[PDB]
Design a protein around this motif. Structure first.
Motif, PDB file in Angstrom:
ATOM      1  N   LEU A  74      -2.430   9.524  -2.901  1.00 33.65           N
ATOM      2  CA  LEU A  74      -1.833   8.589  -1.952  1.00 33.65           C
ATOM      3  C   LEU A  74      -0.317   8.694  -1.928  1.00 33.65           C
ATOM      4  N   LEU A 128     -13.622   0.924  -5.678  1.00 36.03           N
ATOM      5  CA  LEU A 128     -12.617   1.938  -5.385  1.00 36.03           C
ATOM      6  C   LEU A 128     -12.897   2.609  -4.044  1.00 36.03           C
ATOM      7  N   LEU A 131      -4.764  -0.788  -6.596  1.00 35.45           N
ATOM      8  CA  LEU A 131      -5.021   0.390  -7.411  1.00 35.45           C
ATOM      9  C   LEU A 131      -4.267   0.323  -8.726  1.00 35.45           C
ATOM     10  N   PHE A 190     -10.745   2.625  -0.613  1.00 36.52           N
ATOM     11  CA  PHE A 190     -10.551   3.868   0.125  1.00 36.52           C
ATOM     12  C   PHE A 190     -10.921   3.708   1.595  1.00 36.52           C
ATOM     13  N   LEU A 236      -6.057   9.546  -7.720  1.00 38.51           N
ATOM     14  CA  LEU A 236      -5.981   8.874  -6.430  1.00 38.51           C
ATOM     15  C   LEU A 236      -4.581   8.353  -6.126  1.00 38.51           C
TER      16      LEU A 236
HETATM   17 NA    NA Z   1      -8.408   5.676  -3.458  1.00 41.05          NA
END
Ligand code: NA
Ligand SMILES: N=C(NC(=O)c1nc(Cl)c(N)nc1N)Nc1ccccc1
Ligand code: NA
Lengths: 46, 209, 213, 47, 213, 202, 214
Positions: F126, A15, C145, A19, F122
């Motif tokens: 984003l 992760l 993600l 990033f 997250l």
């Molecule tokens: Na992230």
């Protein structure tokens, strides 16, 4: 097998990987600094 | 792309050949192919053929072999031994093929990562252009991806398919052995049909009813 | 826009489905789906109510398929061995269906995180490859993600808990069916209601229900 | 437990993370490319 | 500097693996395990076809293999079947335990190798992240981290774990060899028909990994 | 750091999944047994042996021993008391294994939803990502979820599971001691030989 | 060296591991584990051949090992063989249980050290990102996080797990030495010859983990 915190650690590491590639995608690198980084790495690896 | 799958499969084969010889490896691939391009025979047709032969007194190779063995003239225990040996041989082959593809699945990601680390060595040792650092890494990291795909989407699925095919052949062959025994002993067709109907509704089939 | 959501859901759910269909058959997947739906929208009949209906029937001599089958096979089959065999077969069959639905959803929950990791690998590959088109790293990072997040959510909040609910429901159905079988045996030999109640009273706290007391 | 190779996977991910930290160590901020990234991420993430 | 980096990475990985194994295993154990790995990689186990041939040859007779020699000596020495069977079963168990323990030593190496590789990458990355002020530090530090991780992976996957696998395969091969030897010596002592024992020993040829038909 | 929404996410979701796994009455059962295994020390086996010797000499602090004495007072035979004590021991073992299962389940689900929560934070960041200077700290709060799961996984729930396992082992041991003492008392045998027999089991 | 040392990280790792160990062990059992670890790491265990040498030397006549001192003291006391055997067997079992518990404590330490290393690196990454105004300066901040991780890794792989394994090895050696002492003391109590026991005593010298050696 491996302990479950190993999976937590791998997930967190990937992760952060996502990033930091995101962060670098909008950042410009130095030229001479990178050339000298590359030279040091080339010397170090053989 | 191509060199990446080449490295993963070459390393996997190389490491796996210290467990399975080329003869056993090719036997495993042959079993997987035969289970993938062919269809298993449904037990309903087998039950129909068994009851047809029982009322009377075949393409299926086990069926032909058993019927020939029983029409040749042999004790009940002898046919039991022959059928059990054949069934166990097929079971062992299927378990070993599952083992080969399971071992490929276990070894594939580690070799993907080894290929990635070798690629990163080869990249950091020839760093020349920053804008091209990314895709170079992408190529090295690419190897890892294939390992994952070959671990979860090729080798492990074939291991599962061979396990499933093994249960299917074990069930079909158990039905065949019971039907052949009923044929030899001249049992009433109704009790044998009851046993076959009971056997068709156990295991992973149970969800379909 | 919609491409990244459909791509993430595609990688995760399609990979899980492909692997599970290589593991199970489409009809068996549908059977497991039906079992999960039945376990999640109908409440299992309480055992105490079952004992109440059992004693009411014993004293006399609905809304439950198993005991209705028992009383239908009772008026016809006078022997107790035929009824015992049929009832045990039905109990074992239902246990099998629940165990295999548990297996299907445990397989889904096992495979989904693997698809999430493959997804983040794919996102890393794509956005490390492009690194120069802003319209190309957005979708890639979103895919990484969201594949990871869908793997996590579907694994730990849908499929694993559906499997655990199916295991719990299997235990409850096993208990209810065993009690109904005992009641059918009791009506077979015409046992007194008091003794059968005393013989069943050790079932209100058996296993999990032992923590409450 | 976990796959025995997960150890090497965390190794690889940590090596890559630290490599990218080093690449950030001499990286410089850009505003236009930042805005492009933010907008494309907003469009992908359904906002 | 590069030679220093290679030496340091090999030292971290191999020295740490050796030290951690030496705590677990006696030095005599480690030496014997290396000897067994060499013997497995250096000698090809005699094919079971040849042993079946030899067994039927002394079956209809009423020499290379050492266990054959021991069995023949015990059979000539007029020692009853129980004593001979128990003694040579003890010998088989001894070779099984030896191969198991050598497999354990190489498994321990393959477990500790990526652990030491991770220790190495943690050390190298700590050194690099502390020393962003110079190349002369981050070059060798990154090289140490990456090479120690890569050596951990390679030694664990392509040396130590496959040596454990080859040792286990050779253990199964030698167990089959000596079980065939037991069956042959017992059949000789009974003096059964050479054809029947020939077929019954060929029956063992369809065991384990050799299903290649 | 501290953060209310993050600990809420971890704790609420862990409870939610475990509730689909365990009933909420079983949740109290496990929590109460953890509290009793932490705060009330189990008596030394030697003290129970001393009480056994004192009772044999005469012809109580534990519930098990007191119930055994009450069962022997009205002269219940060997088989019935053996069955009752075995049922009680298996009941206690079941309750302890259930509590260990509850806390182990919390151990597996806490970091899973740590990852779930940090991923959600997250994607939220984003999707609302405007300021460069704040990309750092925002994700920091996201990691706050992960960390909590980690702590709860490793410093609270897993150790309580292992403590419950230990307490269960010792409880079965002491209750086997108690059944042996009950049998010796209903035998009426001399203290010395029965003490030797029990000391043989340790 | 300065860049590999931080007091908050070592404090986190050791404090948390000690806490988690104390929720499963007591302070007394932890102290016993530490004493046994020190005794194993400082005082070597006697080779059995020297034990047979001393046994045969004192058999026909009928001192460094304290168990043999206890054995000869009970032999001089005149206690019947049953009580001497019971007491000696109790001592062996006590030592075996203590060694297994020491192994368990150090295995618990090695299990929970890297878990708290990950917890510590989580704390460090939290701090690094919470004080992250520009990725230019994140080297040392990330470094201390990696440092807590490395402390966990080193303590698990090179201290606690090696101590646990050395304690298992020392307990195997202790079992061998104790049982040889048992057999020798029994032979002395009976009053037999020194040579006769040496025929059956060497049969099981390489038992278990020594079976690979031959
Ligand atoms: Na992230
Ligand atoms: N990369 C390493 N690998 C292992 O730790 C490992 N690998 C294998 Cl194969 C095994 N059997 N046991 C292991 N502990 N992870 C890691 C170590 C220490 C800190 C953080 C991460
Ligand atoms: Na992720």
């Amino acid at each position: 097998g491996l302990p479950l915190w190993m999976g937590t650690f791998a997930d967190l590491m990937s992760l952060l990987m996502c990033f930091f590639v995101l962060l670098l995608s909008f950042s410009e690198m130095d030229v001479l600094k990178f050339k000298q980084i590359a030279g040091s790495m080339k010397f170090a690896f053989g | 792309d191509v060199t990446s799958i080449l490295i993963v499969v070459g390393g996997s084969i190389f490491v796996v050949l210290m467990k399975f010889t080329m003869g056993q490896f090719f036997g495993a691939t042959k079993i997987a192919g035969k289970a993938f391009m062919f269809k298993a025979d449904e037990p309903e047709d087998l039950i129909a053929k068994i009851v047809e032969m029982a009322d009377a007194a075949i393409n299926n190779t086990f069926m032909q072999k058993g019927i020939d063995l029983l029409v040749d003239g042999h004790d009940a225990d002898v046919v039991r031994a022959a059928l059990k040996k054949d069934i166990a041989l097929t079971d062992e082959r299927h378990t070993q093929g599952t083992g080969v593809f399971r071992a490929f699945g276990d070894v594939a990601p580690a070799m993907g990562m080894i290929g990635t680390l070798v690629g990163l060595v080869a990249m950091l040792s020839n760093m020349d252009d920053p804008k091209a650092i990314g895709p170079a890494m992408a190529v090295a990291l690419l190897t890892t991806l294939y390992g994952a795909i070959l671990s979860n989407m090729v080798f492990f699925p074939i291991a599962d398919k061979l396990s499933l095919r093994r249960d299917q052949e074990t069930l079909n062959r158990r039905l065949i052995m019971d039907g052949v025994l009923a044929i030899q002993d001249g049992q009433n067709p109704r009790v044998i049909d009851s046993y076959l109907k009971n056997y068709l509704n156990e295991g992973k089939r149970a969800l379909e009813i």
